[PDB]
């Protein structure tokens, strides 16, 4: 999020930026009392999928973890319709949601 050019990394970003906003404001950010981060981002509209990445803190619980990306995954379809809505685009290409917490690394 910070590269202002004519390249597929502008866009990128833009979208970045946007899902990551989304992806921290339509999320339950304030609802897990932890900030997430993108430490990922893969946008293929070359056909129509996508795959996006979340880190949270939520590993500190493994009942947060497990409910809360339990809501996470149902709320899956939520923000990418979401997302599209909120972009109000086409291409709407499976940008999956995935969760990379300290529950699967603990470095997270």
């Known amino acids: ?8 990394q502008r ?3 833009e ?11 339509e999320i339950k950010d304030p609802r897990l009392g932890m900030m997430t981060t993108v430490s990922g981002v893969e ?3 070359d056909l129509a999928y996508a795959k ?14 497990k409910a809360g990306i339990k809501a996470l995954q149902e709320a899956s379809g939520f923000i990418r319709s979401l997302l599209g809505k909120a972009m ?5 290409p499976e940008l999956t949601f995935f969760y990379d917490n300290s529950l699967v690394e603990g470095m997270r």
């Open 43 to 45: 946008m293929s509209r």
């Open 1 to 8: 999020m910070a590269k202002e050019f004519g390249r597929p």
């Open 15 to 25: 979208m970045q930026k946007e899902i990551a906003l989304i992806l921290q404001r």
């Open 11 to 13: 866009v990128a970003q």
């Open 88 to 92: 109000r685009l086409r291409i709407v």
């Open 52 to 65: 996006v990445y979340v880190t949270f803190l939520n590993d500190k619980d493994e009942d947060a973890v």
